[PDB]
Nanobody, 116 residues
């Protein structure tokens, strides 16, 4: 019972910056983490329900992950972009219940291209 709406992204020059957004709706209370992954589908940045943040070594100091809890939206503030940052970036929300049931939800994938 989580829906994710991705937005943002596009084309930037090397050293450029972009914001990705991933809006969540539905069973928010059960989400333990949300994050962006690129593609192996590898972790870029994650934020958990208490706001702890985790960054891939390749992106730390350049990318910031944040949330606006007033809108259940998580943001990936990409900066100092490199051509190797070029990829489809997917938003994930991972859900865990009291029951022990779990769920994993993925957005449709947002293209980021860093070039010329």
């Amino acid at each position: 019972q989580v829906q994710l709406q991705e937005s943002g992204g596009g084309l930037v020059q090397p050293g450029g910056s972009l914001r990705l957004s991933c809006a969540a709706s539905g069973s928010i209370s059960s989400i333990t983490t949300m994050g962006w992954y690129r593609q192996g589908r590898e972790l870029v940045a994650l934020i958990n329900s208490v706001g702890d943040t985790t960054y891939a070594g390749s992106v730390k100091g350049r990318f910031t992950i944040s949330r606006d809890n007033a809108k259940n939206t998580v943001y990936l503030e990409m900066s100092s972009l490199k051509p190797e940052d070029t990829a489809v970036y997917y938003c994930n929300a991972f859900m865990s219940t009291n029951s022990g049931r779990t769920g994993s939800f993925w957005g449709q994938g947002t293209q980021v291209t860093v070039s010329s």
